[model samples]
Target: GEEQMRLPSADVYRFAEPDSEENIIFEENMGIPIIKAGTVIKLIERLTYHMYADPNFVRTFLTTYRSFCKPQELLSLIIERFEIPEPEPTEADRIAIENGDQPLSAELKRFRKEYIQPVQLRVLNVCRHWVEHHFYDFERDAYLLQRMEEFIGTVRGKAMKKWVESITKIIQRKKIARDNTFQSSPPTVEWHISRPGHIETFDLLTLHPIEIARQLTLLESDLYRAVQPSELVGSVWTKEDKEINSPNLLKMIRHTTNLTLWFEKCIVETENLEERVAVVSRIIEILQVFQELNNFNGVLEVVSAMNSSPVYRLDHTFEQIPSRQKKILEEAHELSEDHYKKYLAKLRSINPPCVPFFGIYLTNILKTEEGNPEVLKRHGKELINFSKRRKVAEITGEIQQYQNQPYCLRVESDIKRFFENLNPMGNSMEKEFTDYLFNKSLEIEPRNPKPLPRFPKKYSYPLKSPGVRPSN
Candidate 1:
């Protein structure tokens, strides 16, 4: 029993065409056996199998391989795979071909086409995709650019030439865009607000709620899409040099934290009960827009702030809110609870491009890493736990799925600039900020206040300003 370590296993499966006997085997549970997560060279070899394999393997490899390996390493490994020499034709076959033995020569040629050309073709195909979709790798590394160009120069045949040509043109286009242009950034007009100095105040009422939500969705999506798979591997985002290793993920997470703080500050800082109610209502309306737009990240931030102990304790302030808005807030709270089951379900139900609550994925990746062992012993031999990497890839694949579908909304620069400039409390000061807000909440609505007298006098409330007065 000691010899049996009970290595993890997946259900075996195979696919076949109805009229054809040809079939391919795969793990029913794991989809396709990619590689045992052992050696870097093994991974590079399986990037494209010598035989038939899933096209997506290559796509997933290119998209997320940065986490585990460098572009330089992959480029070199793939080129090495391509350069592997095929065994030479036997002497009898050579003589038969020279003797004009048509059938024999055709068989030899078929062997080369079937066995040799496929592996080489897949190599060039991967190169085409890398240069086209992931041009940044080349842009960032001059050595890669030089190496790829040199590889392209040695290719022959029109079909192969097309791949080379296409890759070449894209590289040229990216170079032009990178060298001398602001065109790479989103097109922008003059800043909408002409304030002399930096705008200190964030007047939520002055802005259109829908536009606020729209700009946020676009902004967060931009940040979400830039996050690479390498950033999530090993939970590196939590450690130091995160700025260098996982800059995009860090930026997005910080922005989310700030958004939550902004929501809390807007509600807790407003001293007047009537004004606070209005601000709270405005945020609720913005949250409704966030829900409609499938911006779960936005909804999560706003909901978390509203449900915080400080904000929730403001019973008197909440009492002033209309029933309809409260119902919306209730639903936001419901969707946020149950450990995000409904949240994930709703996320799956919607079509992207959506800004998903990214923290959920971060949690999932961390959990997977914690749960799975990095190596295993089988028959007294150590095997790299490639299964773990496959699981990681699956989660990252889902992240990539949403990353591709960008929201089709116009950027409202005025609101965009405002969100960018929001200077919320950092993590170091969050506890102090929460404490202050709690004290503020107690002042507004003391804990367990005594019941009002039966003949409680009705106070006359001030008239509500329908909205911001016409600018004129």
Candidate 2:
């Protein structure tokens, strides 16, 4: 009842053809290739060689082979055969060895000697240079502001014929006061005498402080508008075109400050007796500049500071205040809010649409077996150019035409089609893409094949039997 069924020894015979084509055909029908023993052995050796050469292939093979092996046994085999050697002792280790002490605990310190430290140093150097360059610009802007202040002071009366004429005679009489206060002397000519005359006749003479201040603030706004931080940082070779103009900074600060101060001084000097119209109008203009220049943070800080000031709490009747002031303050606050809301809306709209597209493009190109390095390089350049052009168009309010260009659209369409064709069923494309990468990695063989002898054995060896007989 206890009989063992043993297979024939011929079943294991090497270099033997199958007994008949029908036997081979039956094996082939079972989905197994009926290759020769030598061929099967060669194929197994090739797979082993590939696995030895490629870490990714080894990993994939191990993952697939894990189902057939116990985890502990598989791990033991791997550790015994293929474990990586411990890294060589670094400089720190040498120091520790010399000192007869334990190495430093920091992993970063341990690894820094292996290329990382040099890279870090390079990054630090770049950052330092960047800071130095920007600091120079900051100092230059400050100097420009100082020069502007000097120029504004010097050029003030030159542009004011009325101040020049009135002050010249007053200086001759030695009656001109050191302070800017007007004297109680009788007027030499009626101040309103030119009302019926050409308004431009006293262009220089009627330089109203409020109007001058408004013009200066507007000039400052223009300067702020033109100065872009990106221009200084984005390029390797900084050009004069990217440099912020010294005069622009100076003029802007000087004008803005002068206007703000003049309005404040007028409000105080007139004891709120002057119509608030001039002060209100100038303030409104300044607020508009703040809004346009995206200087809301600055405006908020200034407003917060003003709120804390005793001057802001002073009792001034509403009727005594200029109507223009009330009107301007109302409009400025509304516009500033509107500007902020619009900016937020734009960010919200663009972020969602652009992020997914960019992420998909990057992942598809970077994490695939079919990833072409040269193609990625070309695409990166194109993306940068596209981003720059889009930014410029947006800033200048120029309509973007490239997005609708036929060539661009066609290229985009082709890319979409290629991705779709890569995975007919989109559900498994990402997974299949990952599997394809693993499979490709497994194709590389390790060591070169052994070379065949240059001379054939038949020509090199004598008839064999004659040599053996002589030795005997």
Candidate 3:
């Protein structure tokens, strides 16, 4: 045994080492049996290969070894290399140990990357997604970005407060930028008038596509009233609130609804092939206008309406469409392509004056609302639900932005003119629009109901589909 003040060997003791238990216990404690420099290090190396072995024991063994060791060098080395091991052994790692294995080669590595690599990545990603989407991390990045802006503003405010004699063209440039960056809204009236309108009039087919765009771009006042954050809910609108904050959002639904109706009317009314072709051309033109204006909501609405059975049943009408036109339409209708991967990329790259299909946005909101719990985190005698509020704030902020914009295009409303107009187009258009998919004839009996149709995954929206479809 090694001698020290605490475990002093008698002066009379011989140079022959005592058969002591202390060195043995210390050695066993480190998962080592020998009191040598290499023992603990070797134990640590063995432990590293199997992290799932035992957590507390590994920590304990390493810690005990560090405490007993004198030089301190080996302790630091072990500590540096230590990692908390993942519990399950990934047998897929055998791929890494295989001969002539090229983990970095895309052709050879695709399977492992797809099946095995993603397993761990999924664990990590799902974990991060929760962190990102839940608790205090809600809109955290955006919040930090806002805070950064405030810091810049404070710095600028302080500098502008001074009356220094020093000057340069940089100062002039910054001054101009500062004014613009912190620029106030335009006069309420002009700002109000300059906004884009929603599902406004039936004059769309009558106007050129470019002109239609200009008209859509020109909003006024009433639309702003509908799109306010206050319309949705309070700081804490519960489930009892019907999960609704504002009727403004409903206006969009109504808008899309009307656009859908107008399109159906256009298709059904055109009696001849030439006229129907003209109608499709107009619809395509309008879709382009919708996309160009970043009104993705309108784009989707139009696409879906056209893809519905009523329009698609008219395959004969669609064949007249050029391959070039068909390709463009396909590009717009790629929802199934990436579950909207491409659309989201486009959405992110663009600036506002844009409108997303709120249907999809709300679908996601409901999913999050259902999956996560209400109360998330807590501390000693303190509680917070910044998560729910974060969502509310975001939902409200969008409405608030819309409300702040001037939306109503104060115009010569032929309110009286429309009221006085005679119905020459007849009652049949409305009745026909109402019943496109009718009851099957008595000949098609219950004995043999038609086999259900197949789709790529889900049945898609309107098209050269010429059969009767619902107005939805």
- Best of the two (1, 2) by lDDT: 1
Cα TM-score per model = 0.73, 0.24, 0.41
Regions of model 1 farther than 4 Å from truth: 1-26, 29-38, 86-114, 155-159, 177-202, 225-236, 239-241, 348-354, 379-384, 400-410, 426-472
Q: Is candidate 1 or candidate 3 better by lDDT?
A: 1
lDDT (tens digit, per residue) of candidate 1 on 1-472 = 4211121112211111111111121233534654444444545556655567557767666765765677888888788767644334467877776788743454446545764466667788888889877776786678998999998779886667777788788788888887772223442222222332334533465555666777888899899899977678767788775776688899998898788877887777776677778778878878887888888889888888888887987787789898988998898777757788788789888875578888888989999988987665554544446566667778877888888766656676656888877776755487887787777666655668553222222223332333211122
Error of 2 at 338 (Å): 16
Query: lDDT value for candidate 1?
Result: 0.69
Name the candidate, 1 or 2, with the larger TM-score value: 1
**Residue-wise C-alpha lDDT for candidate 3, range 56-105, written one tens digit per residue:** 33333332232223213432333333211222223454475475453444
The numbered model that scores best in TM-score is: 1
Worst 10 residues of 3 by lDDT: 438-447
Show model 2 residue runs off by greater than 4 Å: 1-262, 275-282, 285-317, 320-472
Estimate the overall C-alpha local distance difference test score of candidate 2: 0.30
- Where in model 3 is the C-alpha error above 4 Å? 1-204, 217-226, 230-245, 335-337, 374-386, 395-472
lDDT of each: 0.69, 0.30, 0.41
Ranking of predictions according to lDDT: 1, 3, 2
In terms of lDDT, the poorest run of 10 residues in model 2 is 463-472
TM-score, predicted candidate 2 vs. hidden true structure: 0.24
